């Protein structure tokens, strides 16, 4: 790190509280989509949200001041500013931004973009020098005064300048799944002080595989030597010329409207107000997700059965009980060595996100001609006398080429199959019957002849035999301990979360409960089939499932075409304030004027009118509903 200088004054300037308008929209995915509405839960700036009216540097006799603060990163940062002086040069991201942690660096000059991620030691007020090159009459960077040490770089990127060429440039910085996603957009404006109203779907610039924890940031500025004079004076530089404006992304739900060009034109937050949330319900609140599966288990022994050196005959199909293990089906589904892959009830994909009580493994060897009849509901000697699949089979059936396995010089006649059985095998039945079959009225007593025949015949699968005659291995997976990957995350109580238990998913609040599920019950439900509570594995504790703060959301809408003003109906609550306004955000829970308690429930804001009118849009309890350019309510008339 460079030698650091003390420029910040003890005098502090207070922050401000102003609106974000409708800025900060960026593309959630790179998949080309057009004229489609996409819902997503990710990090964003809500509309009308708190953005601070910061001043990076401010000159307040000739008295001048300098106060460049430090802000944490949390989940994500949105930045934009109105400046064409290029004094704003870059940013730093990371956790502490000292030499203790790996940190990323982006470099931009008149030539190109340079990126490096070494162990940098950043000063409290990092800066770069700039000077006027009078013979060529150009402002040029002089020296680097940010870091004197750079070790262990793991990424480098070179491209044309993006922040170079009243000038509003708007940038988005993310670091997700090891990729540092940078979204960029530039806009000339006709404003000075505030962030202008209106929408701007901000363009995705580039994704960069950095992969480092980031919890704090600070904007990078290039300070002129004028203030670097030994006094507190900046003779040739406006020590107040730089101001920044930063908002914090929050995990929120958004819907994106696409045009026929594939370009995003408008978006609506479900967390703006119930008036906005109305359009979310009609297509015209959670903050986090928690995932917990049965854990503390090893891997499942698929290789012990799939990759077995010796494979049993078809009439001797086996049972392996599979339990207390984690199963990875991607290596099985995506193996390039399985010609037959049919699953019933469950999809071939997303098996790694599913859990099962018990799984049975079926394995044998049959020829290519015998591959086709391996399916539920088939008929034949294998199907009727050797192996009968249940009609209601839940699982997968797998067959593939296994050609080069069971040949020998001199004839290999190991495997056999059944020709005679009086009755079909039941679903999941075993019969080891090998009695000498009687084909007549004379009891055979193990002696063959006319009407007395041996029920078993040796295959003798031969390599020189035809392709269909050649042995191909087949596997059936019976689904009744076993789960897909994901180490269970710790639990969080009293917070609105998206929960995923042992294959069951849902959203709500996890809290302690008194309902005692039976020692082998994992989930319990009340009336209307609502998952009321779940019992936590590895601790056998019971957690209640409470919806986040209530009331059914029914749309009372005149229509978007005429006006965007409607009313909210609370069916069976007293005038208890949405559980004492737990959120209290979003314009103070959407203004929390007139309170009109009805037999149909409690109503906020809408005036009650003494006289009655013909019913237009009912709310309940005899009251229907615009007039005086405002939302109105009145008792319905009977004629």
């Amino acid at each position, epitope marked *: 790190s460079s030698q650091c200088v003390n420029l910040t004054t003890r005098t502090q300037l207070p922050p401000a509280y102003t609106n974000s308008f409708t800025r900060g929209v960026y593309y959630p995915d790179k998949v080309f989509r057009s004229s489609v509405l996409h819902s997503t839960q990710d990090l964003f700036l809500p509309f009308f949200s708190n953005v601070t009216w910061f001043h990076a540097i401010h000159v307040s006799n000739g008295t001048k001041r300098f106060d460049n603060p430090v802000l944490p990163f949390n989940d994500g940062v949105y930045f934009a500013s109105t400046e064409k002086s290029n004094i704003i040069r870059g940013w730093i991201f990371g956790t502490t931004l000292d030499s203790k942690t790996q940190s990323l660096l982006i470099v931009n000059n008149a030539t190109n973009v340079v990126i490096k991620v070494c162990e940098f030691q950043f000063c409290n007020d990092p800066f770069l020098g700039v000077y006027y090159h009078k013979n060529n009459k150009s402002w040029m960077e002089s020296e680097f005064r940010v870091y004197s040490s750079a070790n262990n770089c793991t990424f480098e990127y070179v491209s044309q300048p993006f922040l170079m060429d009243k000038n509003l440039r708007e940038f988005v910085f993310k670091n997700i799944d090891g990729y540092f996603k940078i979204y960029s957009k530039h806009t000339p404006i006709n404003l000075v002080r505030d962030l202008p109203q209106g929408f701007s779907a901000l363009e995705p610039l580039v994704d960069l595989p950095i992969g480092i924890n980031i919890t704090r940031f600070q904007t990078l500025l290039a300070l002129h030597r004028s203030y670097l004079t030994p006094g507190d004076s900046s003779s040739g530089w406006t020590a107040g010329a730089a101001a920044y404006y930063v908002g914090y992304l929050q995990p929120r739900t958004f819907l994106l409207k696409y045009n026929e060009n594939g370009t995003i034109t408008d978006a609506v937050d479900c967390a703006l107000d119930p008036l906005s949330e109305t359009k979310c319900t009609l297509k015209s609140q959670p903050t986090e997700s928690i995932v917990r599966f049965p854990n503390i288990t090893n891997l499942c022994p698929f290789g012990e059965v799939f990759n077995a050196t010796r494979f049993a005959s078809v009439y001797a199909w086996n049972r392996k009980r599979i339990s207390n293990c984690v199963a990875d089906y991607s290596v099985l589904y995506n193996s390039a060595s399985f010609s037959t892959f049919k699953c019933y009830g469950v999809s071939p994909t997303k098996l790694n996100d599913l859990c099962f009580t018990n799984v049975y493994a079926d394995s044998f060897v049959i020829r290519g001609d015998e591959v086709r009849q391996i399916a539920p509901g088939q008929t034949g000697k294998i199907a009727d006398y050797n192996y009968k699949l249940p009609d209601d089979f839940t699982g997968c059936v797998i067959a593939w080429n296994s050609n080069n396995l069971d040949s020998k010089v001199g004839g290999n006649y190991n495997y056999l199959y059944r020709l005679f059985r009086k009755s079909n095998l039941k679903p999941f039945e075993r019969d080891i019957s090998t009695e000498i079959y009687q084909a007549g009225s004379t009891p055979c007593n193990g002696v063959e002849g006319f009407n007395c025949y041996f029920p078993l015949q040796s295959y003798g699968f031969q390599p020189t035999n035809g392709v269909g005659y050649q042995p191909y291995r087949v596997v059936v997976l019976s689904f009744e301990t076993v789960c897909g990957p994901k180490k269970s995350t710790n639990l969080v109580k009293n917070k609105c979360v998206n929960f995923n238990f042992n294959g069951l998913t849902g959203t709500g609040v996890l809290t302690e409960s008194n*309902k005692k599920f039976l*020692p082998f019950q994992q989930f319990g439900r009340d009336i209307a089939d609502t998952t009321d509570a779940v019992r936590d594995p590895q601790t056998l504790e019971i957690l209640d499932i409470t919806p986040c703060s209530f009331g059914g959301v029914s749309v009372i809408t005149p229509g978007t075409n005429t006006s965007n003003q409607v009313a909210v109906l609370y069916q069976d609550v007293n005038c208890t304030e949405v559980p004492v306004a737990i959120h209290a955000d979003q314009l103070t829970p959407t203004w929390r004027s007139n309170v009109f308690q009805t037999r149909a429930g409690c109503l906020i804001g809408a005036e009650h009118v003494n006289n009655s009118y013909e019913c237009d849009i009912p709310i309940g309890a005899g009251i229907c509903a615009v007039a005086s350019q405002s939302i109105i309510a009145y008792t319905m008339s009977l004629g």
Partner: antibody
Amino acid sequence: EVQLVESGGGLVQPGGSLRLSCAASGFTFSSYYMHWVRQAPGKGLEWVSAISGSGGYTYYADSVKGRFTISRDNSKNTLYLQMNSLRAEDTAVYYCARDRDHAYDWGFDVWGQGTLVTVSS
Amino acid sequence: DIQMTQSPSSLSASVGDRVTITCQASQDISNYLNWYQQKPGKAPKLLIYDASNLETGVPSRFSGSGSGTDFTFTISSLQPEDIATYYCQQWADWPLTFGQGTKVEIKR
């Protein structure tokens, strides 16, 4: 003394309706799990329904699913068994059945005496 | 559902003998099993719970054990008041089924 007297039993036509009463005394009927069990004339027992947490919750059998409804009450601490669309196999002596599963004991509570129910023409 | 095909349907022995009545099971209920005693025309009563633990006020001659798919239970010494038919219950979650019954009687 804990005593589960039953009332409401009697003769009902097929498809009829009836509410059975099991007054509870000697204990907090509003804090102990309480059940219903039926036992066919001359045959074994069969589980019917239960209140998971006295004062709330629900629990039915598939053999009584939709056809039959369980309910309790607060204050006077009485138990009810609402039968709808009764059948011939529904004929049995019925016991307003007990329960203590919520606590460490995994069994039931008292066994009141239980009273006959018959469905015939 | 859980099925228990108790055998024998009915057995008899003399006073003081040891009696074994078989409760089977369906799927590894471990030790979540309770026992019931029911006299003719009388309300059923517990005999052993947790597959090994006698309730208070229960004769020590009544005892049971087992896990998985076979549950033994013994009447160490038949008594004139031991006359009854005994039921083995399924205390597995999803509580659907009782025992089909084992009737015990006296040689005389």
